[PDB]
Amino acid sequence: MTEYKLVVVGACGVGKSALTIQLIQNHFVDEYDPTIEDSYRKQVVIDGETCLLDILDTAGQEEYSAMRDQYMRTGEGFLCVFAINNTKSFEDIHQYREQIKRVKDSDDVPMVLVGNKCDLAARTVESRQAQDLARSYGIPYIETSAKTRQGVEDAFYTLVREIRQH
Ligand X SMILES: Nc1nc2c(ncn2[C@@H]2O[C@H](COP(=O)(O)OP(=O)(O)NP(=O)(O)O)[C@@H](O)[C@H]2O)c(=O)[nH]1
Q: At 13, phi and psi to the nearest 5?
A: 80, 10
Residue 154 binding Ca ion, by CB under 5 A: yes
Measured from the CB atom, is 31 or 107 closer to ligand X?
Answer: 31
Q: Is 18 annotated as a binding residue?
A: yes
Q: What residues from 130 to 159 belong to the interface with its own copies (CB under 8 A)?
A: 130-131, 134-135, 138-143, 151, 154, 157-158
Q: What is the arrangement of strands in the sheet containing 111-116, beginning at the earlier edge strand?
A: 38-46, 49-57, 2-10, 77-83, 111-116, 141-143
- Read out DSSP for 117-137? -TT-S---S-HHHHHHHHHHH
Q: Is 140 annotated as a binding residue?
A: no
Q: Is 17 annotated as a binding residue?
A: yes
14, 17, 53, 152: which one binds Mg ion (CB under 5 A) = 17
Q: Is 49 annotated as a binding residue?
A: no
Pick from 68, 43, 13: nearest CA to 160: 43
- Say how many C-beta atoms besides its own lie within 10 A of residue 136's C-beta: 10
Which one of ligand X, Mg ion, Ca ion, none interacts with residue 68, CB within 5 to 8 A by kind? none
Pick from 8, 37, 3, 5: nearest CA to 22: 8
Amino acid at the residue 97: R
Which one of its own copies, ligand X, Ca ion, none interacts with residue 60, CB within 5 to 8 A by kind? ligand X
Pattern of binders to ligand X over 29-68, x per CB under 6 A? Answer: xxxx-xx-----------------------xxx-------
Binding residues for GTP: 13-18, 29-35, 59-60, 116-119, 145-147
Annotated binding site: 13-18, 29-35, 59-60, 116-119, 145-147
